[PDB]
């Protein structure tokens, strides 16, 4: 078992999703956390759109990434391409991955369902390489 941070360049009004799927798919395998890069909260829409899958994320972002320690986490997932707006210790973890995905913010429920499909496959691949 190992710890994973899931993040985007900014978190205010962004849905991200992959953190909620990673603990719903693999919490007996890995520990998952999500954080802001500045003082923020995930999309209020994200809770209801991840709850279509039964996913529990009501208050998951409480603190910025820079409030934590990077070396606690073997993996850091940047969901919006590069991490860039975070300290260098988070890009230097062993499984630092840049995922070039979209965010559901500003677009339809069909895009939330599209992102859930793409993210499910990405998160299952992540777990199946870090297992």
From Swiss-Prot:
Can you tell which superkingdom this protein's organism belongs to?
Answer: Bacteria
Q: Per the record, a Pfam family?
A: LMWPc
- List UniProt keywords, sorted A-Z: Arsenical resistance, Disulfide bond, Hydrolase, Oxidoreductase, Redox-active center
Q: Which GO terms describe its molecular function?
A: arsenate reductase (glutaredoxin) activity; protein tyrosine phosphatase activity
Give TM segment ranges: none
Catalytic site residues? 8, 80
What does the record give as EC number? 1.20.4.1, 3.1.3.48
Entry-linked InterPro entries: Arsenate_reductase_gluta, Ptyr_pPase, Ptyr_pPase_sf
Disulfide pairings: 8-80, 80-82
Tell me how this protein assembles: Homodimer.
Q: What else is known?
A: Cys-8 probably provides the initial functional group for covalent attachment of the electron-accepting substrate, arsenate, to ArsC.
Query: According to its UniProt entry, what is the function of this protein?
Result: Reduces arsenate [As(V)] to arsenite [As(III)] using glutathione and glutaredoxin as sources of reducing equivalents. GrxA is the most effective electron donor in vivo compared to other glutaredoxins. Constitutes the major arsenate reductase compared to ArsI1 and ArsI2. Also shows weak phosphatase activity toward p-nitrophenyl phosphate.
- Family membership, please give it: Belongs to the low molecular weight phosphotyrosine protein phosphatase family.
Q: What is this protein called?
A: Glutaredoxin arsenate reductase
The protein's organism comes out as Synechocystis sp. (strain ATCC 27184 / PCC 6803 / Kazusa)
